[PDB]
């Protein structure tokens, strides 16, 4: 897959953005119908 | 422990809804299951 | 108009609020003005 | 300090870039100037 890079200033911001990235990754691979059941 | 956020405009709403929905999702999918879904696709 | 969002937790709320305010700022500052700030304060 | 964040896929890269550029802009715009732009 097409891989990209971002420079992030500050450690807290990196932690926040790394969490968003990982969260978005999971949402992309969980069918919406599975996701409504987990909710 | 609940707050409501005011969002001005549709484009910001969709971005911020998306992020919020995604974080909540990570709070309710089990670690082993999340891994399965990432392996699969 | 106005949309509202139910956010769970103080920490998550502060993060999404900061993001909201940052996107707002980005929308009303011209790119030309942005680069002037990015160059002079960094 | 500076960190490098790897992202897979165009969709996600664009969203995260948008957020990160936004965060950085608000680190260099004075509080006073920021509220003037919001009022304008
Ligand atoms: Zn399971």
Numbering used by the authors:
A (entry chain G): 302 to 340
B (entry chain F): 303 to 343
C (entry chain E): 303 to 344
D (entry chain H): 303 to 342
Question: What text does the study give?
Answer:
The tetrameric transcription factors p53, p63, and p73 evolved from a common ancestor and play key roles in tumor suppression and development. Surprisingly, p63 and p73 require a second helix in their tetramerization domain for the formation of stable tetramers that is absent in human p53, raising questions about the evolutionary processes leading to diversification. Here we determined the crystal structure of the zebrafish p53 tetramerization domain, which contains a second helix, reminiscent of p63 and p73, combined with p53-like features.
Size-exclusion chromatography multiangle static light scattering (SEC-MALS) showed that residues 302–345 form stable tetramers. Crystal form II belongs to space group P21 and contains three tetramers in the asymmetric unit. Individual subunits within the tetramer adopt a z-shaped conformation, consisting of a short β strand followed by two α helices (H1 and H2). This helix reaches across the adjacent primary dimer within the tetramer, resulting in antiparallel packing of two H2 helices. Because of the additional H2 interactions, the total surface area buried within the zebrafish tetramer is on average about 20% larger than in the human p53 tetramer (8,100 Å2 versus 6,720 Å2), which is also reflected in the dissociation constants, KDs, of the full-length protein tetramers (KD = 3.6 nM for zebrafish p53 versus KD = 19 nM for human p53 [Brandt et al., 2009)].
